[PDB]
């Protein structure tokens, strides 16, 4: 399909399958959920009745005592020692098929174009590594929360946006569904656009 520009007014040709396909609600949600789960690290643990410091001696005899039968000071129904099902460090990452990941990414890109949240422009660069310059460049464009995607990563643009929370700078290869969804506006360079079709295929 045809992607219009706002600065050079130059036509761009892009496959409609990767930019004009329908929006799959179910597929995108699964990929987004999978991405969040993969961000976890699951560094937690408790002590079961075997790992609690203590001794296995019976608190009192089985019979004769007037109170409930007890077996150990570390039973889960006892104060200061227990946890019936203690947690262990676990991996929460889940598998997502390559095609499913690509399909969700294609679905997300198409809808950004439909909601005009995606803006394609020519090369986006800053002459000097100054956050002030980048802020001015984004101010006249009426953009405050933007994700800058460029074909080639340059330290000059990387340093300029480092201290800008609402602004992110990324490469085409390092593109994730969550970032595209989260950011209000996405700006893609002409080079950045081309690499997307090649990797998306």
């Amino acid at each position: 399909m045809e992607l219009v520009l706002k600065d050079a007014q130059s036509a761009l040709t892009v496959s409609e399958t990767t930019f004009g396909r329908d929006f799959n609600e179910a597929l995108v949600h699964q990929v987004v959920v999978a991405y969040a789960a993969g961000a976890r690290q699951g560094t937690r643990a408790q002590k079961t009745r075997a790992e609690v410091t203590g001794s296995g001696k019976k608190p009192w005899r089985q019979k004769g005592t007037g109170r409930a039968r007890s077996g150990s000071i570390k039973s889960p129904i006892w104060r200061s020692g227990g946890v019936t099902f203690a947690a262990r460090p676990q991996d929460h990452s889940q598998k997502v098929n390559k095609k499913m990941y690509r399909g969700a990414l294609k679905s997300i890109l198409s809808e950004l174009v439909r909601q005009d949240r995606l803006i394609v422009v020519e090369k986006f660069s800053v002459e000097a590594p100054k956050t002030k310059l980048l802020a001015q460049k984004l101010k006249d464009m009426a953009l405050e929360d933007v994700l800058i995607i460029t074909g080639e990563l340059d330290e000059n643009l990387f340093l300029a946006a480092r201290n800008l929370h609402k602004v992110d700078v990324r490469d085409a290869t390092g593109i994730d569904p969550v970032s595209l969804i989260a950011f209000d506006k996405v700006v893609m360079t002409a080079d950045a656009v081309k690499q997307v079709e090649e990797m998306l295929a």
Binding site: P59, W60, R61, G64, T65, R67
Partner: peptide, 17 residues
């Protein structure tokens, strides 16, 4: 609050056989 460390040992007065 504290379990009696000593439990008295009883006897069977009534065989009840």
């Amino acid at each position: 609050n504290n379990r009696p460390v000593y439990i008295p040992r009883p006897r069977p007065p009534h065989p009840r056989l």
